Amino acid sequence: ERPTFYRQELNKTIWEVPERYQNLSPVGAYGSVCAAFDTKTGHRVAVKKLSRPFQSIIHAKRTYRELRLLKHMKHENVIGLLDVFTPARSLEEFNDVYLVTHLMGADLNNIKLTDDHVQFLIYQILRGLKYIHSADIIHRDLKPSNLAVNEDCELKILDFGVATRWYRAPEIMLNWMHYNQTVDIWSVGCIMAELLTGRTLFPGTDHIDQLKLILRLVGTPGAELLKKISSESARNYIQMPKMNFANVFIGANPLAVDLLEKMLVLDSDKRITAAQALAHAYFAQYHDPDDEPVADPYDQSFESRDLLIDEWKSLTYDEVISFVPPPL
Ligand SMILES: Nc1c(C(=O)NCc2ccc(C(=O)N[C@@H](CCC3CCCCC3)C(=O)Nc3ccc(F)cc3)cc2)cnn1-c1ccccc1
């Protein structure tokens, strides 16, 4: 049943991996991540050694959460789990978790982009977000560095864990209660803007400067939206004119400007969803209602639980043991 592991020191870091994975080479920003050769598939992979996975309740829950989320994701435009392993033979000796994913070529932060490429890249993000959102999962940290492409411009959403705040929706700039899945659509708008102009749309130096730069584009809220804000601080802070997107994004595909106007809406209740955005004219070349799948249901009940490290650790171990490799 159990493979043969081999040990190796890489960054004064002990890596213990199955013989399956060869020629481990550190990729050191992304965490403890090595490019490896998978002798079973003949394809290169990424192997992530979780850092101090059971150091604390917080780490333990984070470890469990990352493994639960990765085991769930079965979509072309979302990072998926090829393998998860531990060198541990028992729950008793379980202290290290290794995750195996596809190796991606470059982050979108690395990559003048043509309108074709913007269309295809934002299409693939929305297709992935449709899937993630359908399981009631919110990304919450979409930014160029969390999006990866191969040379084929095939895109995957991931979360590696510059500034998040540049891409963050106004309604979660202060308090994290009154928000929905469309926080991720705001992020998609900021990314798409950047892809079209080669500039950060909203390079705020802090959470208040950020809100200033956003309002300068979308305009200060009307009475309609001001009435839906609970926080005296946030309301009293905000308490001018909406710019013509066609002026700001001069020379863009006018259909890219129209979609941007539907994505960068202050009122999160009126912001276009991933599903709706896919059906926008911009994506006429790439939209197929029969190849934009939704996810299986995702059991998120664990998010509400306050459990001990040994409880989170045992749950993670179960999820390692029950893992079913995807087909080749
Ligand atoms: N560097 C790499 C790799 C890698 O590193 N492969 C391992 C790998 C990657 C991502 C995840 C990952 O996305 N994990 C997510 C869960 C899943 C998401 C859920 C929401 C939707 C999108 C997927 C997570 O839980 N992150 C996390 C965030 C904050 C934390 F405090 C703790 C964890 C896990 C393992 C491949 N390719 N590359 C690569 C190489 C060269 C150039 C560019 C990229």
Short mmCIF file of all heavy atoms in Angstrom, two decimals, residues 27 30 33 45-48 62-63 65-67 69-70 73 78-79 99-107 132 137-139 148-149 157-161, ligand 1:
data_model
loop_
_atom_site.label_atom_id
_atom_site.label_comp_id
_atom_site.label_asym_id
_atom_site.label_seq_id
_atom_site.Cartn_x
_atom_site.Cartn_y
_atom_site.Cartn_z
N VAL A 27 11.02 26.54 -5.69
CA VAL A 27 10.42 27.50 -6.66
C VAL A 27 10.58 28.93 -6.11
O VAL A 27 10.16 29.13 -4.95
CB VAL A 27 8.94 27.18 -6.96
CG1 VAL A 27 8.75 25.78 -7.52
CG2 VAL A 27 8.03 27.36 -5.75
N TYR A 30 6.71 31.39 -2.30
CA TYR A 30 5.39 30.70 -2.35
C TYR A 30 5.14 29.86 -1.08
O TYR A 30 4.05 29.21 -0.99
CB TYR A 30 5.30 29.83 -3.61
CG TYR A 30 5.16 30.62 -4.88
CD1 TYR A 30 6.05 30.46 -5.94
CD2 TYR A 30 4.15 31.55 -5.03
CE1 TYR A 30 5.92 31.19 -7.11
CE2 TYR A 30 4.01 32.30 -6.19
CZ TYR A 30 4.89 32.11 -7.23
OH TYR A 30 4.73 32.85 -8.37
N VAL A 33 7.89 25.40 -1.15
CA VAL A 33 7.36 24.76 -2.39
C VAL A 33 8.54 24.35 -3.27
O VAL A 33 9.43 25.19 -3.50
CB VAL A 33 6.37 25.68 -3.14
CG1 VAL A 33 5.89 25.05 -4.44
CG2 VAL A 33 5.16 26.03 -2.27
N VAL A 45 5.45 18.68 -11.24
CA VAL A 45 4.44 19.07 -10.23
C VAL A 45 5.08 20.04 -9.24
O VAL A 45 6.30 20.27 -9.31
CB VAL A 45 3.83 17.86 -9.50
CG1 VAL A 45 3.03 16.97 -10.44
CG2 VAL A 45 4.88 17.07 -8.73
N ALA A 46 4.24 20.62 -8.39
CA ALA A 46 4.65 21.47 -7.25
C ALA A 46 4.34 20.68 -5.97
O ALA A 46 3.24 20.14 -5.85
CB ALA A 46 3.91 22.78 -7.29
N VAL A 47 5.31 20.61 -5.07
CA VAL A 47 5.12 19.97 -3.75
C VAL A 47 5.32 21.07 -2.71
O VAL A 47 6.39 21.70 -2.70
CB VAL A 47 6.05 18.77 -3.53
CG1 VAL A 47 5.69 18.03 -2.25
CG2 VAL A 47 6.03 17.84 -4.73
N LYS A 48 4.29 21.28 -1.90
CA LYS A 48 4.26 22.26 -0.80
C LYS A 48 4.37 21.49 0.52
O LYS A 48 3.48 20.66 0.77
CB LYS A 48 2.95 23.05 -0.86
CG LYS A 48 2.79 24.16 0.17
CD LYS A 48 1.39 24.74 0.17
CE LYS A 48 1.32 26.13 0.77
NZ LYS A 48 -0.08 26.56 0.96
N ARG A 62 -6.15 26.24 9.98
CA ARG A 62 -5.69 26.71 8.64
C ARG A 62 -5.26 25.50 7.79
O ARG A 62 -5.60 25.44 6.60
CB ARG A 62 -4.48 27.64 8.75
CG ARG A 62 -4.77 29.13 8.63
CD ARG A 62 -3.58 30.01 8.95
NE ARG A 62 -2.30 29.52 8.43
CZ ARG A 62 -1.11 30.07 8.71
NH1 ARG A 62 -1.04 31.12 9.51
NH2 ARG A 62 0.01 29.55 8.21
N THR A 63 -4.48 24.60 8.37
CA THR A 63 -4.03 23.35 7.70
C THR A 63 -5.27 22.57 7.24
O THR A 63 -5.35 22.22 6.03
CB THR A 63 -3.16 22.52 8.65
OG1 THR A 63 -2.01 23.30 8.96
CG2 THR A 63 -2.74 21.19 8.06
N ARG A 65 -8.37 23.53 6.86
CA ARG A 65 -9.12 24.37 5.89
C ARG A 65 -8.47 24.24 4.51
O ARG A 65 -9.20 23.99 3.54
CB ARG A 65 -9.10 25.85 6.29
CG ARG A 65 -9.76 26.78 5.27
CD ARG A 65 -9.79 28.25 5.67
NE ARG A 65 -10.45 28.41 6.95
CZ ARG A 65 -9.86 28.75 8.10
NH1 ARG A 65 -8.57 29.05 8.14
NH2 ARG A 65 -10.58 28.82 9.21
N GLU A 66 -7.14 24.40 4.42
CA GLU A 66 -6.45 24.35 3.11
C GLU A 66 -6.67 22.96 2.48
O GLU A 66 -6.95 22.89 1.26
CB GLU A 66 -4.98 24.69 3.27
CG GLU A 66 -4.21 24.48 1.99
CD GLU A 66 -2.91 25.25 1.92
OE1 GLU A 66 -2.22 25.37 2.98
OE2 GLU A 66 -2.58 25.74 0.81
N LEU A 67 -6.53 21.89 3.25
CA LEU A 67 -6.70 20.51 2.72
C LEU A 67 -8.16 20.26 2.30
O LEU A 67 -8.35 19.71 1.19
CB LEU A 67 -6.26 19.48 3.76
CG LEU A 67 -6.38 18.03 3.29
CD1 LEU A 67 -5.81 17.85 1.90
CD2 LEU A 67 -5.68 17.10 4.28
N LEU A 69 -10.33 22.53 1.32
CA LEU A 69 -10.63 23.39 0.14
C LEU A 69 -10.00 22.74 -1.10
O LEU A 69 -10.69 22.64 -2.13
CB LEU A 69 -10.13 24.81 0.38
CG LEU A 69 -11.00 25.67 1.30
CD1 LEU A 69 -10.25 26.91 1.74
CD2 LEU A 69 -12.31 26.07 0.63
N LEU A 70 -8.74 22.32 -1.00
CA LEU A 70 -8.00 21.70 -2.13
C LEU A 70 -8.64 20.37 -2.53
O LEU A 70 -8.71 20.08 -3.73
CB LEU A 70 -6.54 21.51 -1.74
CG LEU A 70 -5.68 22.76 -1.82
CD1 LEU A 70 -4.32 22.47 -1.20
CD2 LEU A 70 -5.55 23.23 -3.25
N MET A 73 -11.83 21.19 -4.75
CA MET A 73 -11.74 21.93 -6.03
C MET A 73 -11.46 20.96 -7.18
O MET A 73 -10.33 20.44 -7.23
CB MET A 73 -10.65 23.01 -6.00
CG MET A 73 -10.88 24.07 -4.96
SD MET A 73 -12.52 24.82 -5.02
CE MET A 73 -12.61 25.58 -3.41
N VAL A 78 -9.42 26.36 -11.32
CA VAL A 78 -9.10 26.42 -9.87
C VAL A 78 -8.03 25.37 -9.60
O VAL A 78 -8.12 24.24 -10.11
CB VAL A 78 -10.34 26.20 -8.98
CG1 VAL A 78 -10.01 26.44 -7.52
CG2 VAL A 78 -11.54 27.04 -9.41
N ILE A 79 -7.05 25.74 -8.79
CA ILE A 79 -5.97 24.80 -8.38
C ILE A 79 -6.63 23.58 -7.74
O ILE A 79 -7.57 23.74 -6.93
CB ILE A 79 -4.98 25.49 -7.43
CG1 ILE A 79 -3.68 24.68 -7.26
CG2 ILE A 79 -5.65 25.79 -6.11
CD1 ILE A 79 -2.87 24.54 -8.52
N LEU A 99 1.46 18.80 0.07
CA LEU A 99 0.38 18.98 -0.92
C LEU A 99 1.04 18.95 -2.30
O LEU A 99 2.11 19.56 -2.46
CB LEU A 99 -0.33 20.31 -0.68
CG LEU A 99 -0.93 20.53 0.70
CD1 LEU A 99 -1.38 21.97 0.86
CD2 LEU A 99 -2.08 19.59 0.96
N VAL A 100 0.44 18.24 -3.24
CA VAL A 100 0.98 18.16 -4.63
C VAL A 100 -0.08 18.76 -5.55
O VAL A 100 -1.22 18.31 -5.49
CB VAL A 100 1.32 16.72 -5.02
CG1 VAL A 100 1.92 16.66 -6.41
CG2 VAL A 100 2.24 16.10 -3.98
N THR A 101 0.31 19.77 -6.31
CA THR A 101 -0.57 20.44 -7.30
C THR A 101 0.14 20.40 -8.64
O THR A 101 1.35 20.04 -8.66
CB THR A 101 -0.87 21.89 -6.91
OG1 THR A 101 0.31 22.67 -7.06
CG2 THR A 101 -1.39 22.02 -5.50
N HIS A 102 -0.55 20.84 -9.70
CA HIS A 102 0.09 21.15 -11.00
C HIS A 102 1.13 22.24 -10.72
O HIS A 102 0.91 23.03 -9.78
CB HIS A 102 -0.97 21.57 -12.04
CG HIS A 102 -1.74 20.42 -12.60
ND1 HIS A 102 -1.13 19.41 -13.33
CD2 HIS A 102 -3.06 20.11 -12.58
CE1 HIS A 102 -2.04 18.52 -13.71
NE2 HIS A 102 -3.23 18.93 -13.26
N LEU A 103 2.24 22.24 -11.47
CA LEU A 103 3.21 23.35 -11.50
C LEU A 103 2.71 24.37 -12.53
O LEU A 103 2.54 23.99 -13.70
CB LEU A 103 4.58 22.79 -11.89
CG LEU A 103 5.75 23.77 -11.90
CD1 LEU A 103 6.02 24.32 -10.50
CD2 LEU A 103 7.00 23.08 -12.43
N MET A 104 2.48 25.62 -12.11
CA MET A 104 2.04 26.73 -13.00
C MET A 104 3.27 27.48 -13.52
O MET A 104 4.28 27.47 -12.83
CB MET A 104 1.13 27.71 -12.25
CG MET A 104 -0.07 27.04 -11.59
SD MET A 104 -1.05 26.03 -12.72
CE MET A 104 -1.39 27.18 -14.05
N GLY A 105 3.17 28.13 -14.68
CA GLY A 105 4.32 28.74 -15.38
C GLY A 105 4.69 30.10 -14.80
O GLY A 105 5.90 30.35 -14.62
N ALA A 106 3.69 30.95 -14.53
CA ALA A 106 3.88 32.34 -14.06
C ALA A 106 2.58 32.86 -13.43
O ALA A 106 1.50 32.37 -13.80
CB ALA A 106 4.31 33.22 -15.20
N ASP A 107 2.69 33.82 -12.51
CA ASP A 107 1.55 34.56 -11.91
C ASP A 107 1.18 35.70 -12.87
O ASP A 107 2.05 36.14 -13.65
CB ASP A 107 1.84 34.99 -10.47
CG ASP A 107 2.60 36.30 -10.33
OD1 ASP A 107 2.80 37.00 -11.34
OD2 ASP A 107 3.00 36.61 -9.20
N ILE A 132 -16.47 28.30 -7.65
CA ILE A 132 -16.11 28.51 -6.22
C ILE A 132 -17.35 29.06 -5.50
O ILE A 132 -17.72 28.54 -4.46
CB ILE A 132 -14.87 29.43 -6.14
CG1 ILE A 132 -13.62 28.70 -6.63
CG2 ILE A 132 -14.65 30.00 -4.76
CD1 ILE A 132 -12.50 29.64 -7.02
N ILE A 137 -18.17 29.32 -1.37
CA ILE A 137 -16.77 29.66 -1.00
C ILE A 137 -16.51 31.03 -1.58
O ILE A 137 -16.79 31.25 -2.79
CB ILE A 137 -15.77 28.60 -1.49
CG1 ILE A 137 -16.03 27.24 -0.84
CG2 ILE A 137 -14.33 29.07 -1.28
CD1 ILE A 137 -15.46 26.07 -1.62
N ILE A 138 -16.00 31.93 -0.75
CA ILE A 138 -15.53 33.27 -1.19
C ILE A 138 -14.01 33.28 -1.13
O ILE A 138 -13.45 32.80 -0.13
CB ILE A 138 -16.17 34.37 -0.34
CG1 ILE A 138 -17.69 34.18 -0.27
CG2 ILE A 138 -15.75 35.73 -0.87
CD1 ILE A 138 -18.38 35.01 0.79
N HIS A 139 -13.36 33.76 -2.19
CA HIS A 139 -11.88 33.79 -2.25
C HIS A 139 -11.39 34.80 -1.23
O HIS A 139 -10.63 34.41 -0.33
CB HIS A 139 -11.37 34.06 -3.66
CG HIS A 139 -9.90 33.87 -3.76
ND1 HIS A 139 -9.01 34.68 -3.11
CD2 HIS A 139 -9.17 32.95 -4.42
CE1 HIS A 139 -7.78 34.28 -3.37
NE2 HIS A 139 -7.85 33.23 -4.18
N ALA A 148 -2.55 32.19 -11.72
CA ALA A 148 -1.40 31.59 -12.40
C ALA A 148 -1.83 31.13 -13.79
O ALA A 148 -2.97 30.69 -13.95
CB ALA A 148 -0.81 30.47 -11.59
N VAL A 149 -0.92 31.25 -14.75
CA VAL A 149 -1.13 30.79 -16.15
C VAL A 149 0.02 29.85 -16.49
O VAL A 149 1.10 29.95 -15.86
CB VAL A 149 -1.18 31.99 -17.12
CG1 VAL A 149 -2.17 33.03 -16.67
CG2 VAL A 149 0.20 32.60 -17.31
N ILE A 157 -7.09 29.85 -10.52
CA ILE A 157 -7.23 30.64 -9.26
C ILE A 157 -6.57 29.84 -8.15
O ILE A 157 -6.84 28.64 -8.03
CB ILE A 157 -8.71 30.91 -8.97
CG1 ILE A 157 -9.37 31.63 -10.14
CG2 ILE A 157 -8.84 31.67 -7.65
CD1 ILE A 157 -10.86 31.80 -10.00
N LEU A 158 -5.75 30.49 -7.36
CA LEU A 158 -5.27 29.86 -6.12
C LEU A 158 -5.16 30.91 -5.03
O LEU A 158 -5.62 32.05 -5.23
CB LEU A 158 -3.98 29.09 -6.40
CG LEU A 158 -3.06 29.63 -7.47
CD1 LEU A 158 -2.32 30.83 -6.91
CD2 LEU A 158 -2.08 28.55 -7.93
N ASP A 159 -4.69 30.50 -3.87
CA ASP A 159 -4.42 31.44 -2.76
C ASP A 159 -3.10 31.02 -2.12
O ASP A 159 -3.07 30.03 -1.38
CB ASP A 159 -5.63 31.52 -1.84
CG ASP A 159 -5.61 32.85 -1.01
OD1 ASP A 159 -4.47 33.40 -0.85
OD2 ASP A 159 -6.65 33.17 -0.52
N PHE A 160 -2.02 31.73 -2.47
CA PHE A 160 -0.67 31.39 -1.96
C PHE A 160 -0.57 31.82 -0.50
O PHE A 160 0.36 31.36 0.15
CB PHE A 160 0.43 32.06 -2.78
CG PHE A 160 0.61 31.45 -4.14
CD1 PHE A 160 0.35 32.19 -5.29
CD2 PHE A 160 1.00 30.13 -4.27
CE1 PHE A 160 0.51 31.61 -6.54
CE2 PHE A 160 1.13 29.55 -5.51
CZ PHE A 160 0.90 30.29 -6.65
N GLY A 161 -1.47 32.70 -0.05
CA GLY A 161 -1.40 33.37 1.26
C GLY A 161 -0.29 34.40 1.31
O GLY A 161 0.66 34.13 2.09
N1 LIG B 1 4.14 28.02 -6.49
C1 LIG B 1 3.45 27.23 -7.32
C2 LIG B 1 2.62 26.15 -7.04
C3 LIG B 1 2.33 25.78 -5.64
O1 LIG B 1 2.77 26.46 -4.71
N2 LIG B 1 1.55 24.72 -5.46
C4 LIG B 1 1.11 24.30 -4.14
C5 LIG B 1 -0.14 25.01 -3.69
C6 LIG B 1 -0.60 26.14 -4.34
C7 LIG B 1 -1.74 26.80 -3.92
C8 LIG B 1 -2.47 26.32 -2.84
C9 LIG B 1 -3.74 27.02 -2.49
O2 LIG B 1 -4.29 27.74 -3.32
N3 LIG B 1 -4.22 26.83 -1.25
C10 LIG B 1 -5.40 27.52 -0.77
C11 LIG B 1 -6.64 26.62 -0.81
C12 LIG B 1 -7.31 26.53 -2.16
C13 LIG B 1 -7.95 27.83 -2.67
C14 LIG B 1 -9.34 28.05 -2.08
C15 LIG B 1 -10.04 29.27 -2.68
C16 LIG B 1 -10.11 29.19 -4.19
C17 LIG B 1 -8.72 29.01 -4.78
C18 LIG B 1 -8.03 27.79 -4.19
C19 LIG B 1 -5.20 27.94 0.67
O3 LIG B 1 -5.81 27.38 1.58
N4 LIG B 1 -4.32 28.94 0.86
C20 LIG B 1 -3.98 29.54 2.09
C21 LIG B 1 -4.08 30.91 2.27
C22 LIG B 1 -3.76 31.48 3.48
C23 LIG B 1 -3.33 30.67 4.49
F1 LIG B 1 -2.94 31.24 5.67
C24 LIG B 1 -3.23 29.31 4.36
C25 LIG B 1 -3.55 28.74 3.14
C26 LIG B 1 -2.00 25.19 -2.17
C27 LIG B 1 -0.85 24.54 -2.60
C28 LIG B 1 2.18 25.69 -8.29
N5 LIG B 1 2.68 26.40 -9.29
N6 LIG B 1 3.46 27.36 -8.67
C29 LIG B 1 4.08 28.36 -9.48
C30 LIG B 1 5.34 28.14 -10.01
C31 LIG B 1 5.96 29.15 -10.75
C32 LIG B 1 5.32 30.36 -10.95
C33 LIG B 1 4.06 30.57 -10.42
C34 LIG B 1 3.43 29.58 -9.69
#
